[PDB]
Amino acid sequence: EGPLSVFGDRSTGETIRSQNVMAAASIANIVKSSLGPVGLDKMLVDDIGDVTITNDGATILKLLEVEHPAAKVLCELADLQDKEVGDGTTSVVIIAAELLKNADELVKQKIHPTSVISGYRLACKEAVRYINENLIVNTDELGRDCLINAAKTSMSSKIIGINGDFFANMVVDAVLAIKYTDIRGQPRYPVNSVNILKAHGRSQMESMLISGYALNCVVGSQGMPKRIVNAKIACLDFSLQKTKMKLGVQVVITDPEKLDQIRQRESDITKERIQKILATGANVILTTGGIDDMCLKYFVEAGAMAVRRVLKRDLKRIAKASGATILSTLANLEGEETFEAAMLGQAEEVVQERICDDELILIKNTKARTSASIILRGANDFMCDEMERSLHDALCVVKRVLESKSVVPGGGAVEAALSIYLENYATSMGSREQLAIAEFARSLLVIPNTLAVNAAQDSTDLVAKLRAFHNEAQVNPERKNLKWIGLDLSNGKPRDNKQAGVFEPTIVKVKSLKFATEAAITILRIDDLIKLHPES
Amino acid sequence: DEGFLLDKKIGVNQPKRIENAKILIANTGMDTDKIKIFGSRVRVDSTAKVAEIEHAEKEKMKEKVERILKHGINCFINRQLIYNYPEQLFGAAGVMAIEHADFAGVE
Amino acid sequence: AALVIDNGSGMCKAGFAGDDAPRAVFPSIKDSYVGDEAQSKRGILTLKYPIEHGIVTNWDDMEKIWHHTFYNELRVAPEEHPVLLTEAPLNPKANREKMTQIMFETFNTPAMYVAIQAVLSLYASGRTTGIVMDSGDGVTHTVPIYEGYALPHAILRLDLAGRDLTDYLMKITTTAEREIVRDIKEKLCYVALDFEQEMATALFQPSFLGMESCGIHETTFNSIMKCDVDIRKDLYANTVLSGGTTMYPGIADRMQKEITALAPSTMKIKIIAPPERKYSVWIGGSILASLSTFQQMWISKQEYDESGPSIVHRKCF
């Protein structure tokens, strides 16, 4: 406009900073109501009647239709936290928004944004250091109940909260099942290898942990058996169909007497392959490809169970779990075509199980490794999806607890301690960076504030008591046991959360702080905005 | 420029500097060069023969590259492209093969 | 209601009568739940589309498709709803007998009707009389229609479709690069009233491509001249074009001009070719299935049982 003549709008100065802060605040107010054991769920209606109930902040911000870039940044922040950690997706958004708010307050006071950014960076570094040095608990000192407590803490605020007493056991068992050790003998817990199926029907308490694997597939023919005990499993990555010559191959008859034999091979070729498989003892044949009716009949007559269109990832997991080898072809290093019994896997049972008018496959007690599936059972598809998301959060949390053996207390304990320590630590760093670090500290308090607000309790009084306890801990060397104090939101009273069992993986809070700080810094550097009109 | 400048590329495994350069400027195919008989088609009864004919195609390209090298050159500039196999051959021979020069470039 | 399955040498584009859009575009149209609600569809997803060039090659495939376009992508039963299928113009009788045997015997449909794709295209444009120039991916067809029925005697069939069109453009070989030429075919390719004044600033004529039969405008003109001299006015003045092939160059006025030239200096020719609803054949089928004259035209299940391939062929041999 005017002198520039750019074909677009331009915001500049306090205006655009205020806009950015408003956008971030909007995004944070969307999710603030879903934080902590007293947080509540959200409906989302997709303009067509498609409904989604959820407490997962990443999910909420994914479903939203955001236009402002400073709000897309926080949506991407929640997405990144969900990818890298699996929990903290709401706290990170709230913290980023509060850092933006206080930092814009400082910039209005005419503290240069560079100074606010320096102070935020320093405070992030020192908060990470203080956590890593003073606020961590080793899960070794606590045993297995530490994992159950971390799972219950992650599941609190979800639709599997009160039933956590039992869901955590499943979650813990599931991760322990999928444990595998790699080179360097380091134990790895590759969740997303736990299969999670949903089936409305029986109550949550009837959700099932399958030691083995569950397939959202069924047998290919109703004449095939639907239970096999000493399951010898053949995992194939090719289709079992009438043989079709490839693109560069043509059949051209000039003697009709050959046509019959050619047609016959089109099927006999496939027959021979199946016979080879069945010759080894394979009672169960899973394939990523298809299986013609002609082939399904061979499986029927052999007394085998064939399954087609299985998913590649399900197949990889069944193979890894049972001891089988995924074959893309029946072809060896001798230029022939055979199938060895060593390429088979094993399992103590394979069944076609009924689940509320819908059948699935259960592979139970696989050898060469233990695998895990979870069938979630609720009242309808909405609840089941929310249970899946909650369980994914819990599994990710338990995985993080097992990889790094450090936990921190919950209930705003970490944020209160950091607020105290950083408001004391700012006194040493400059004069304006001091203000920035003090504001970082104060911003961290938005978590216990929000928890108490959601509990419908006196946020001011509760957080003041928290800060009093933590100051007593940091100025009286005889009272460091107060560090473990945080909010009890069922009674509105501080509480020793290390003894209450409110644990969170250190990586959760650390990554929350780091990502929130970078997001706030990114947004806090914008002092101009050029919004171009669309090319059309 | 006291000499000349060309905005084209040198091959991958081929030299990057050449002194006392003897140059062959060409307008050949060197790009899956097919016999101009257009009705020509490979029609056989065995993939073995398809592979033999593919090997023969490659041997034809190799003999073309060898006829080129019999000129005693270090630089080869082609108006048309130079595919991976002749590029490899020129590289093994120690010849800088500049490709995709234009009619103007070669003139 | 009446299921309107529009094969149209495209996708299945199936649905119900009264719907302004199909509900079952199967070819190139959940998980983690329990049941066979993805695997059964995962099978069909990689199954070759039977219709090629507007003609059914593999019938088992087509039947499996229809079955999966009834039980899965519509979740209905054909035993109680009449079906309106579509066929390409000049479609062999054998294909008709096959699909009528499939519907009545396999799907046990109470009644069904097979309509010509060009007739339904004309219906979707709101008219009942006119000559439709349908040029798709494999075939070109001129269908004269009077009183809403494709006159089975004046259907002139020439072959200059998307393939034949992009051919010369390729001439001016590899799949990707001939598809660059075809991308230009898909994009703007404005028809030239006169190639002279169009190349100066740089199908109608067989010699151009290399054929020796007739232009599309000659084809339309002779299809109109093999009809009644009284309906000639309507054929000349209600020429409706259809087909993405003919749409891409947007040929209206070059045709119009040379057809006017061919025709006597009496009938005024107007070509309506701006719709591009991308479901014209489906909407025409829906209109027909909504009408009561469709109940009139029903080949009923009892009729089928009593006559067989003869009822599908409507006698009159």
Ligand SMILES: Nc1ncnc2c1ncn2[C@@H]1O[C@H](COP(=O)(O)OP(=O)(O)O)[C@@H](O)[C@H]1O
């Ligand atoms: N049982 C509990 N008692 C006190 N505080 C809790 C409890 N469970 C969770 N919190 C606190 O609530 C915060 C957010 O939890 P939650 O909303 O479930 O995860 P997210 O923030 O990833 O959505 C955590 O920082 C944790 O400190």
Ligand SMILES: [Mg+2]
């Ligand atoms: Mg959580």
